[PDB]
Amino acid sequence: AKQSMKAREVKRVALADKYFAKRAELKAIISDVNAASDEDRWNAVLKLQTLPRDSSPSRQRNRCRQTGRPHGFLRKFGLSRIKVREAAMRGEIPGLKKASW
Amino acid sequence: PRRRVIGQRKILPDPKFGSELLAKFVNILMVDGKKSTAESIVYSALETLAQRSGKSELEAFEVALENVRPTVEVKSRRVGGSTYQVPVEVRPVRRNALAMRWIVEAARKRGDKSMALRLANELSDAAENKGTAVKKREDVHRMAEANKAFA
Amino acid sequence: RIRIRLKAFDHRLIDQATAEIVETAKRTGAQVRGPIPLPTRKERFTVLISPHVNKDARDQYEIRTHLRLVDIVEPTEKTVDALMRLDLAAGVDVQISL
Amino acid sequence: ARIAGINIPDHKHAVIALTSIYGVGKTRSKAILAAAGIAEDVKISELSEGQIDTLRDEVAKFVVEGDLRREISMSIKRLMDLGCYRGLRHRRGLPVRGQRTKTNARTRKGPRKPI
Amino acid sequence: GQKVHPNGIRLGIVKPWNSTWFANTKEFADNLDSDFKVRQYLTKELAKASVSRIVIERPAKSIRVTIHTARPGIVIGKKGEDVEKLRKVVADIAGVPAQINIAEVRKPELDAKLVADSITSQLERRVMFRRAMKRAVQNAMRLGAKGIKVEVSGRLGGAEIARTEWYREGRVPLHTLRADIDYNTSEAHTTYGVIGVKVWIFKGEI
Amino acid sequence: RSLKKGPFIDLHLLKKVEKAVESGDKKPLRTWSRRSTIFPNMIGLTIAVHNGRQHVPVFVTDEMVGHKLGEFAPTRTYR
Amino acid sequence: NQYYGTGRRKSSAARVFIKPGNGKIVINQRSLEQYFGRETARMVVRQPLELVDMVEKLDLYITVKGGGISGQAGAIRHGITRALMEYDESLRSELRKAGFVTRDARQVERKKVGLRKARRRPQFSKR
RNA sequence: CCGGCCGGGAACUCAAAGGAGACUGCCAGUGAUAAACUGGAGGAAGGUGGGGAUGACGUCAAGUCAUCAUGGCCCUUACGACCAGGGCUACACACGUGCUACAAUGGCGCAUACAAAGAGAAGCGACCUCGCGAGAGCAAGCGGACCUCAUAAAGUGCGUCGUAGUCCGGAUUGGAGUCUGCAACUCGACUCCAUGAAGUCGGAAUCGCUAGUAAUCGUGGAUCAGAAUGCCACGGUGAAUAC
RNA sequence: AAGAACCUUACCUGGUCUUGACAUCCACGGAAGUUUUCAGAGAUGAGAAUGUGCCUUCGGGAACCGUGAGACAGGUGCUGC
Ligand SMILES: [Mg+2]
Ligand SMILES: [Mg+2]
Ligand SMILES: [Mg+2]
Ligand SMILES: [Mg+2]
Ligand SMILES: [Mg+2]
Ligand SMILES: [Mg+2]
Ligand SMILES: [Mg+2]
Ligand SMILES: [Mg+2]
Ligand SMILES: [Mg+2]
Ligand SMILES: [Mg+2]
Ligand SMILES: [Mg+2]
Ligand SMILES: [Mg+2]
Ligand SMILES: [Mg+2]
Ligand SMILES: [Mg+2]
Ligand SMILES: [Mg+2]
Ligand SMILES: [Mg+2]
Ligand SMILES: [Mg+2]
Ligand SMILES: [Mg+2]
Ligand SMILES: [Mg+2]
Ligand SMILES: [Mg+2]
Ligand SMILES: [Mg+2]
Ligand SMILES: [Mg+2]
Ligand SMILES: [Mg+2]
Ligand SMILES: [Mg+2]
Ligand SMILES: [Mg+2]
Ligand SMILES: [Mg+2]
Ligand SMILES: [Mg+2]
Ligand SMILES: [Mg+2]
Ligand SMILES: [Mg+2]
Ligand SMILES: [Mg+2]
Ligand SMILES: [Mg+2]
Ligand SMILES: [Mg+2]
Ligand SMILES: [Mg+2]
Ligand SMILES: [Mg+2]
Ligand SMILES: [Mg+2]
Ligand SMILES: [Mg+2]
Ligand SMILES: [Mg+2]
Ligand SMILES: [Mg+2]
Ligand SMILES: [Mg+2]
Ligand SMILES: [Mg+2]
Ligand SMILES: [Mg+2]
Ligand SMILES: [Mg+2]
Ligand SMILES: [Mg+2]
Ligand SMILES: [Mg+2]
Ligand SMILES: [Mg+2]
Ligand SMILES: [Mg+2]
Ligand SMILES: [Mg+2]
Ligand SMILES: [Mg+2]
Ligand SMILES: [Mg+2]
Ligand SMILES: [Mg+2]
Ligand SMILES: [Mg+2]
Ligand SMILES: [Mg+2]
Ligand SMILES: [Mg+2]
Ligand SMILES: [Mg+2]
Ligand SMILES: [Mg+2]
Ligand SMILES: [Mg+2]
Ligand SMILES: [Mg+2]
Ligand SMILES: [Mg+2]
Ligand SMILES: [Mg+2]
Ligand SMILES: [Mg+2]
Ligand SMILES: [Mg+2]
Ligand SMILES: [Mg+2]
Ligand SMILES: [Mg+2]
Ligand SMILES: [Mg+2]
Ligand SMILES: [Mg+2]
Ligand SMILES: [Mg+2]
Ligand SMILES: [Mg+2]
Ligand SMILES: [Mg+2]
Ligand SMILES: [Mg+2]
Ligand SMILES: [Mg+2]
Ligand SMILES: [Mg+2]
Ligand SMILES: [Mg+2]
Ligand SMILES: [Mg+2]
Ligand SMILES: [Mg+2]
Ligand SMILES: [Mg+2]
Ligand SMILES: [Mg+2]
Ligand SMILES: [Mg+2]
Ligand SMILES: [Mg+2]
Ligand SMILES: [Mg+2]
Ligand SMILES: [Mg+2]
Ligand SMILES: [Mg+2]
Ligand SMILES: [Mg+2]
Ligand SMILES: [Mg+2]
Ligand SMILES: [Mg+2]
Ligand SMILES: [Mg+2]
Ligand SMILES: [Mg+2]
């Protein structure tokens, strides 16, 4: 699913773990109902855009690891709906037999 | 079913008037599976009927249901080619059930106030045969009587 | 006391794992209640079976996570050390808790 | 039964009587009768004139009828003069709150037309 | 296309899971990716060594890989030198330690992957698809098979329109769930295109 | 509408406006930030908002304050 | 002394104890009159106590959880018929012929894949 | 102190495993001395007991080259590649599939009873306190039969409206907000307030459904920062009819 | 499509890059990194400080970073006849 689209996603993962998995203090702690509500809260949201557009974990689409398909994802397996099926009935996901109740 | 001759399910008696005839009537009146709302209306109707009529409930419901009961109904078979009116003697299980539908179907219309009022007034008119349900039986006879030429 | 809880995917791999952990504890240094079962977690997944269109057609999968408890009611010196460094049983997760 | 601009109902509960006033609904009407000290179960025929005069001063607090109609008319007319996205939406006769305009929108767009 | 994967329907009943490990919901996805990374790598590296399936286990941060194979000599090489070369490179991408074990298979013609890869290899060297298919069907019935359905889909023999052809000899009950059936597929990348090679091998009734 | 924690403008547009206002009136500012709100200090400026293919000049008035810049720049043309 | 019968009509699971004494019917510490109100049938629990008469013979301490009204009320009916085993096969000859001891398995059907709810298919477009 | 709270208890519900069990197996009758079958016992269950998975050879050169793989044929200071916005949400119209209606078996208020199946660690987030409410703080506990989202709603029980475009519908608009999120105007969801459109059961047509099924009332999950009336599951009350 | 505000996004506008965002090499210079400032819509470009490690053939290393060079990398472009 486009090697550029797969390769631009590695920036999104690597660069997010750098900034906002550490510098969420800029938005969370500072922008709060307390004594910093005056210019300190203004300088927070001002400085929050100085950061790159990426880094925000909302910008991560969360696509399949094998193929790179954006849609049809499953968080348990980290795979697309097609590749989980191909892998399940084959012997790769442990315990994942066909359900029938 | 094409060749699957199986019987029907058993029903249950209504606590306050433990029988069968009016137990079916609750079921035909019931909308959206709400037997709690429907069964309260039938008791409210038959109590208001028994007050006015000066009878019990089962015999009050009977002298009413028989007055809207079809003797013969009209089918139409094409045996040979053409389509014509063939009357047939209705079966005893369907006979009284087809009557209970015509009482309730009439009571959908005739917007008095409440459902308990409307069924009471329909069964009251059925006792003195001058409602809508008796007219629907009357018309059903007129077809069988007029189209009696076809066996 | 030590509440030992252990879970797995196969229903008939965990049985000998629960049998051997109890026997290497009951026999070596006494005391055991038994294999307390607990409810099974059945995480279901309903994926689309085709690669394009055909929404009606799907396959349904599940993963039975079978739990088990052990529950000993005395901190025995022979038993407590037999739990550590002496488990094995692959495909069966185990979590000892004091 | 003559408060505010209009309000002339009869054989209707006091809470439902004041819904007919433009600028007063269900919950506002409960706040009127709570402040006035009148029961919601009574009706205007049952009430006396001594109690109706207290309702007149209570609804005078809130913006109602011709005061409200102009406040809404000002706000819509303001948007159209600015030439904003909502102003273009209003004067063109199309739905405003980011709605679907392709299949539906019949309330705002009006009934069906020929092609 | 409307048939269930014969291995998959029997994963609880008769056939086993190849990846046999427990993991909590957090690690599960990353643990399954590293499982695919070694499997993809180890299959392509050990091509001539002739691997059927790869079983993987993970008891308490220790990845025990098992390579079921027809030719165990080519996997190990000389004095188990290639085992140590595999041990190192597999351990890096996967997760800390390694424990590669090699299971021999004295009846290689009854394993579905090895028959499919043999037919694939033959199709790539300009051998007739019938002479590759029927000979493989004939070879394993004499040894110890009771089924052996073999389908070959695609262009085959440089044709314009693609055809699907199959030749079986015996009982191959795909519907029977108690029945053990080795099923496997392989693609044959020729000059004309891709040629699929599905193989079913009914061994035992239970 | 959203955002109680300070009305939002992009750093670049804030600094560009502050630099433009202190100097004096000049020309339409090429800005792509539609998302940004309009401050009281922006009144008088004829900033050019990006509709998508071109820049639409918008003379900011007393009323155009709480509204955002993209409201005065129709994207999809019709008839 | 104190006999027992299970009953578990439709998810719900009754737990009927029965002793020889007063005519009362206790259930979850509530009275039978107030626990089961106007709904459809209170006396489905008392249906099995008709061919074998109660009146003032057998007191019933009941406990139930699961289902709703009729699921519980029907589970108590099955629970009582199972519980009435103190005169083994003499009662069950007359009791079985009027239904009663039949579990009546019928549970809610699962939602099918593709279909809108169990049997209800969506619609049909033929152009 | 009066709540499974308490020691404790191992009966029962349940939870799991491993077994019993329904076998036309018994019983008569129709049959051809057969396969069968009509009922009848016994039984929790009766003739594949209900439901699921399971999909033969092959049909439609059916769908997918945009999941992936892939033979050719094509592009390479571009059909490749990074960024800010805009767009996929456009709107004389036409249909599909829904949902909410058009009410009185109903609508709004107060007294309060009964589920299942899930799900949760940058998670799900009590009780408290601030909120008219979305929510805002503090933060308890739980990788869970325990802790949490979580009061199920239908349903009763009282009240009140009394057939009105209505106390039906709840659209649409204006204002005031809330959380998420760098950012909510194009283009979110929800809340409050006022607003109160069409609609009074639908032309030719036409759809699904054979019992816990239709019908109706909740509820969950997957994808998911946020964003279901969809989808996938779950359980309540519970019909008619099959000559 | 198991959920389009940016992302996704394959489309459009304008800005932009050509061994490229993603890869192994032949080899030139540097630890990797981290903090922080300026012009710009942002991609980017310009800096300013600090740190200067696991083995010595010590003209080297095993990674990482940024140059020039080509084998090339890359295409959700067409063809499900
Ligand atoms: Mg690719
Ligand atoms: Mg997203
Ligand atoms: Mg389909
Ligand atoms: Mg369809
Ligand atoms: Mg309102
Ligand atoms: Mg309100
Ligand atoms: Mg809306
Ligand atoms: Mg729109
Ligand atoms: Mg094919
Ligand atoms: Mg199938
Ligand atoms: Mg134009
Ligand atoms: Mg059960
Ligand atoms: Mg019997
Ligand atoms: Mg089905
Ligand atoms: Mg249902
Ligand atoms: Mg269709
Ligand atoms: Mg049609
Ligand atoms: Mg049609
Ligand atoms: Mg047609
Ligand atoms: Mg026989
Ligand atoms: Mg036989
Ligand atoms: Mg016999
Ligand atoms: Mg004979
Ligand atoms: Mg005979
Ligand atoms: Mg014989
Ligand atoms: Mg015989
Ligand atoms: Mg026989
Ligand atoms: Mg029988
Ligand atoms: Mg029978
Ligand atoms: Mg049989
Ligand atoms: Mg059978
Ligand atoms: Mg079956
Ligand atoms: Mg059978
Ligand atoms: Mg069976
Ligand atoms: Mg079968
Ligand atoms: Mg075609
Ligand atoms: Mg077609
Ligand atoms: Mg098709
Ligand atoms: Mg492709
Ligand atoms: Mg090519
Ligand atoms: Mg060529
Ligand atoms: Mg050429
Ligand atoms: Mg071109
Ligand atoms: Mg679309
Ligand atoms: Mg929308
Ligand atoms: Mg025109
Ligand atoms: Mg239409
Ligand atoms: Mg209302
Ligand atoms: Mg309603
Ligand atoms: Mg759970
Ligand atoms: Mg709580
Ligand atoms: Mg509270
Ligand atoms: Mg409120
Ligand atoms: Mg806040
Ligand atoms: Mg909180
Ligand atoms: Mg705990
Ligand atoms: Mg506790
Ligand atoms: Mg919830
Ligand atoms: Mg609680
Ligand atoms: Mg709550
Ligand atoms: Mg509570
Ligand atoms: Mg109610
Ligand atoms: Mg009006
Ligand atoms: Mg009208
Ligand atoms: Mg509204
Ligand atoms: Mg109105
Ligand atoms: Mg009306
Ligand atoms: Mg209709
Ligand atoms: Mg209706
Ligand atoms: Mg039709
Ligand atoms: Mg039909
Ligand atoms: Mg059927
Ligand atoms: Mg409703
Ligand atoms: Mg709701
Ligand atoms: Mg739901
Ligand atoms: Mg969730
Ligand atoms: Mg829903
Ligand atoms: Mg719904
Ligand atoms: Mg973009
Ligand atoms: Mg361009
Ligand atoms: Mg290429
Ligand atoms: Mg390509
Ligand atoms: Mg193109
Ligand atoms: Mg085709
Ligand atoms: Mg094909
Ligand atoms: Mg096509």
Short mmCIF file of N, CA and C in Angstrom, two decimals, chain G residues 10-89:
data_model
loop_
_atom_site.label_atom_id
_atom_site.label_comp_id
_atom_site.label_asym_id
_atom_site.label_seq_id
_atom_site.Cartn_x
_atom_site.Cartn_y
_atom_site.Cartn_z
N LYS G 10 -35.15 -20.30 30.34
CA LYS G 10 -34.66 -19.17 29.55
C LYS G 10 -33.71 -18.23 30.31
N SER G 11 -32.42 -18.58 30.35
CA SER G 11 -31.37 -17.81 31.04
C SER G 11 -31.55 -17.73 32.57
N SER G 12 -32.70 -17.21 33.00
CA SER G 12 -33.13 -17.24 34.41
C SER G 12 -32.95 -18.60 35.07
N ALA G 13 -32.65 -18.59 36.37
CA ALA G 13 -32.38 -19.80 37.14
C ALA G 13 -33.00 -19.72 38.53
N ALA G 14 -34.14 -20.39 38.70
CA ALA G 14 -34.83 -20.46 39.99
C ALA G 14 -34.14 -21.44 40.93
N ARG G 15 -34.52 -21.38 42.21
CA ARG G 15 -33.90 -22.21 43.25
C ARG G 15 -34.92 -22.46 44.37
N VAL G 16 -35.84 -23.39 44.10
CA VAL G 16 -37.03 -23.60 44.92
C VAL G 16 -36.78 -24.60 46.04
N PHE G 17 -36.89 -24.14 47.29
CA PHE G 17 -36.96 -25.02 48.46
C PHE G 17 -38.41 -25.13 48.91
N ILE G 18 -38.77 -26.31 49.42
CA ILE G 18 -40.16 -26.61 49.80
C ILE G 18 -40.19 -27.46 51.08
N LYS G 19 -41.04 -27.05 52.03
CA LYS G 19 -41.19 -27.74 53.32
C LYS G 19 -42.69 -27.87 53.64
N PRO G 20 -43.07 -28.90 54.42
CA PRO G 20 -44.47 -29.03 54.83
C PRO G 20 -44.82 -28.10 56.00
N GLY G 21 -45.70 -27.13 55.76
CA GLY G 21 -46.13 -26.20 56.81
C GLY G 21 -47.26 -25.27 56.37
N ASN G 22 -46.97 -23.97 56.35
CA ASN G 22 -47.96 -22.94 56.02
C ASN G 22 -48.18 -22.85 54.50
N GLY G 23 -49.25 -22.17 54.09
CA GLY G 23 -49.56 -21.95 52.68
C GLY G 23 -48.80 -20.83 51.98
N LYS G 24 -48.04 -20.03 52.73
CA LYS G 24 -47.29 -18.89 52.17
C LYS G 24 -46.20 -19.27 51.17
N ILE G 25 -45.87 -18.32 50.29
CA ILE G 25 -44.82 -18.46 49.28
C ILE G 25 -43.87 -17.26 49.38
N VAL G 26 -42.73 -17.47 50.03
CA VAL G 26 -41.69 -16.44 50.15
C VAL G 26 -40.79 -16.52 48.90
N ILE G 27 -40.29 -15.37 48.46
CA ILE G 27 -39.41 -15.29 47.28
C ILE G 27 -38.50 -14.05 47.34
N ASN G 28 -37.18 -14.29 47.43
CA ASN G 28 -36.17 -13.22 47.59
C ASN G 28 -36.47 -12.25 48.75
N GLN G 29 -37.00 -12.80 49.85
CA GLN G 29 -37.49 -12.04 51.02
C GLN G 29 -38.79 -11.24 50.77
N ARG G 30 -39.27 -11.20 49.53
CA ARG G 30 -40.52 -10.52 49.17
C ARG G 30 -41.67 -11.51 49.23
N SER G 31 -42.89 -10.99 49.31
CA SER G 31 -44.10 -11.79 49.16
C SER G 31 -44.36 -12.04 47.68
N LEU G 32 -45.09 -13.12 47.38
CA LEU G 32 -45.42 -13.48 45.99
C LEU G 32 -46.36 -12.47 45.33
N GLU G 33 -47.26 -11.88 46.12
CA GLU G 33 -48.22 -10.89 45.63
C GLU G 33 -47.54 -9.61 45.13
N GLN G 34 -46.56 -9.13 45.90
CA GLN G 34 -45.86 -7.87 45.59
C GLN G 34 -44.67 -8.02 44.63
N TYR G 35 -44.03 -9.19 44.61
CA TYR G 35 -42.88 -9.44 43.73
C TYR G 35 -43.33 -9.56 42.27
N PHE G 36 -44.30 -10.44 42.03
CA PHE G 36 -44.96 -10.57 40.72
C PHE G 36 -46.29 -9.81 40.75
N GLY G 37 -46.31 -8.62 40.15
CA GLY G 37 -47.52 -7.79 40.09
C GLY G 37 -48.34 -8.06 38.83
N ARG G 38 -49.02 -7.03 38.34
CA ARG G 38 -49.71 -7.09 37.04
C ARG G 38 -48.67 -7.13 35.92
N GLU G 39 -48.62 -8.24 35.20
CA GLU G 39 -47.65 -8.45 34.11
C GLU G 39 -48.21 -9.39 33.05
N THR G 40 -48.58 -10.60 33.46
CA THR G 40 -49.34 -11.53 32.60
C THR G 40 -50.02 -12.61 33.43
N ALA G 41 -49.21 -13.37 34.17
CA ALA G 41 -49.70 -14.43 35.04
C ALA G 41 -48.85 -14.58 36.29
N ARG G 42 -49.43 -14.23 37.44
CA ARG G 42 -48.84 -14.51 38.75
C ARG G 42 -48.92 -16.00 39.05
N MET G 43 -50.07 -16.60 38.74
CA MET G 43 -50.38 -17.98 39.14
C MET G 43 -49.76 -19.09 38.27
N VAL G 44 -48.86 -18.76 37.34
CA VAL G 44 -48.02 -19.78 36.69
C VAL G 44 -47.14 -20.54 37.70
N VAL G 45 -46.69 -19.85 38.74
CA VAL G 45 -45.97 -20.51 39.85
C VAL G 45 -46.90 -21.45 40.65
N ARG G 46 -48.17 -21.07 40.77
CA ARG G 46 -49.20 -21.88 41.44
C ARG G 46 -49.94 -22.88 40.54
N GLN G 47 -49.69 -22.87 39.23
CA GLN G 47 -50.22 -23.90 38.31
C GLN G 47 -49.85 -25.34 38.69
N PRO G 48 -48.56 -25.61 39.00
CA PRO G 48 -48.19 -26.97 39.44
C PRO G 48 -48.79 -27.39 40.78
N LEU G 49 -49.16 -26.41 41.62
CA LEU G 49 -49.86 -26.66 42.88
C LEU G 49 -51.38 -26.63 42.70
N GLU G 50 -51.89 -27.49 41.81
CA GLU G 50 -53.33 -27.62 41.53
C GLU G 50 -53.76 -29.08 41.38
N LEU G 51 -53.07 -29.83 40.52
CA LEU G 51 -53.24 -31.29 40.45
C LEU G 51 -52.75 -31.93 41.75
N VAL G 52 -51.67 -31.38 42.30
CA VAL G 52 -51.23 -31.65 43.67
C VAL G 52 -51.55 -30.40 44.49
N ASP G 53 -52.57 -30.47 45.34
CA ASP G 53 -53.11 -29.29 46.03
C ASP G 53 -52.16 -28.74 47.11
N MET G 54 -52.08 -27.41 47.20
CA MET G 54 -51.31 -26.72 48.24
C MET G 54 -52.25 -26.34 49.38
N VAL G 55 -53.07 -25.30 49.16
CA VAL G 55 -53.95 -24.72 50.19
C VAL G 55 -53.17 -24.27 51.44
N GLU G 56 -52.91 -25.20 52.37
CA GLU G 56 -52.16 -24.92 53.60
C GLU G 56 -51.27 -26.12 53.98
N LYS G 57 -50.65 -26.74 52.97
CA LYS G 57 -49.86 -27.96 53.15
C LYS G 57 -48.36 -27.68 53.11
N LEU G 58 -47.90 -27.11 51.99
CA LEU G 58 -46.48 -26.93 51.71
C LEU G 58 -46.09 -25.45 51.61
N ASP G 59 -45.16 -25.02 52.46
CA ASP G 59 -44.58 -23.66 52.38
C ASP G 59 -43.40 -23.64 51.39
N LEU G 60 -43.28 -22.54 50.65
CA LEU G 60 -42.27 -22.40 49.59
C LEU G 60 -41.34 -21.21 49.85
N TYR G 61 -40.08 -21.50 50.17
CA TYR G 61 -39.01 -20.49 50.18
C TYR G 61 -38.27 -20.59 48.85
N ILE G 62 -38.36 -19.53 48.05
CA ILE G 62 -37.80 -19.50 46.70
C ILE G 62 -36.74 -18.40 46.60
N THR G 63 -35.77 -18.61 45.71
CA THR G 63 -34.79 -17.59 45.33
C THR G 63 -34.49 -17.74 43.84
N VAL G 64 -34.48 -16.63 43.12
CA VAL G 64 -34.28 -16.63 41.67
C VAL G 64 -33.47 -15.41 41.22
N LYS G 65 -32.66 -15.60 40.18
CA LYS G 65 -31.99 -14.50 39.49
C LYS G 65 -31.71 -14.85 38.03
N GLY G 66 -31.80 -13.84 37.16
CA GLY G 66 -31.65 -14.00 35.72
C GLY G 66 -32.97 -13.78 34.99
N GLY G 67 -32.88 -13.44 33.71
CA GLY G 67 -34.07 -13.23 32.87
C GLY G 67 -34.86 -11.98 33.22
N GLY G 68 -36.19 -12.10 33.20
CA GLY G 68 -37.09 -10.99 33.54
C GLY G 68 -38.25 -11.44 34.41
N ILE G 69 -39.48 -11.31 33.90
CA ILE G 69 -40.69 -11.65 34.66
C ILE G 69 -41.10 -13.09 34.40
N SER G 70 -41.46 -13.38 33.15
CA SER G 70 -41.96 -14.70 32.76
C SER G 70 -40.85 -15.75 32.70
N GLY G 71 -39.63 -15.31 32.41
CA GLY G 71 -38.45 -16.17 32.51
C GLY G 71 -38.24 -16.70 33.91
N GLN G 72 -38.40 -15.82 34.91
CA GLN G 72 -38.33 -16.22 36.32
C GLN G 72 -39.57 -16.98 36.77
N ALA G 73 -40.75 -16.49 36.39
CA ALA G 73 -42.02 -17.12 36.75
C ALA G 73 -42.16 -18.53 36.17
N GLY G 74 -41.71 -18.71 34.93
CA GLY G 74 -41.66 -20.03 34.29
C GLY G 74 -40.60 -20.95 34.87
N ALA G 75 -39.49 -20.37 35.32
CA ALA G 75 -38.42 -21.12 35.99
C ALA G 75 -38.83 -21.61 37.37
N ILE G 76 -39.65 -20.83 38.06
CA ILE G 76 -40.23 -21.24 39.34
C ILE G 76 -41.23 -22.38 39.14
N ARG G 77 -42.01 -22.34 38.06
CA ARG G 77 -42.94 -23.43 37.72
C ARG G 77 -42.20 -24.75 37.52
N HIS G 78 -41.12 -24.72 36.75
CA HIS G 78 -40.28 -25.91 36.54
C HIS G 78 -39.58 -26.32 37.83
N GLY G 79 -39.12 -25.33 38.60
CA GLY G 79 -38.48 -25.57 39.90
C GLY G 79 -39.38 -26.26 40.92
N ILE G 80 -40.66 -25.89 40.94
CA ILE G 80 -41.64 -26.52 41.84
C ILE G 80 -41.96 -27.96 41.43
N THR G 81 -42.10 -28.19 40.12
CA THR G 81 -42.41 -29.53 39.60
C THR G 81 -41.26 -30.51 39.82
N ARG G 82 -40.03 -30.01 39.70
CA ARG G 82 -38.82 -30.77 40.07
C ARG G 82 -38.75 -30.97 41.59
N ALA G 83 -39.09 -29.92 42.34
CA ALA G 83 -39.09 -29.96 43.81
C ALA G 83 -40.10 -30.95 44.39
N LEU G 84 -41.26 -31.08 43.75
CA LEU G 84 -42.26 -32.06 44.18
C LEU G 84 -41.85 -33.48 43.78
N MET G 85 -40.90 -34.02 44.55
CA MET G 85 -40.42 -35.40 44.39
C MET G 85 -40.51 -36.21 45.69
N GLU G 86 -41.19 -35.67 46.71
CA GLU G 86 -41.30 -36.36 48.01
C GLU G 86 -42.20 -37.60 47.93
N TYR G 87 -43.17 -37.57 47.01
CA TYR G 87 -43.99 -38.74 46.67
C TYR G 87 -43.63 -39.19 45.25
N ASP G 88 -42.34 -39.48 45.06
CA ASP G 88 -41.69 -39.80 43.76
C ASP G 88 -42.56 -39.83 42.48
N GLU G 89 -43.06 -41.01 42.08
CA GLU G 89 -43.69 -41.20 40.77
C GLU G 89 -45.22 -41.12 40.78
#
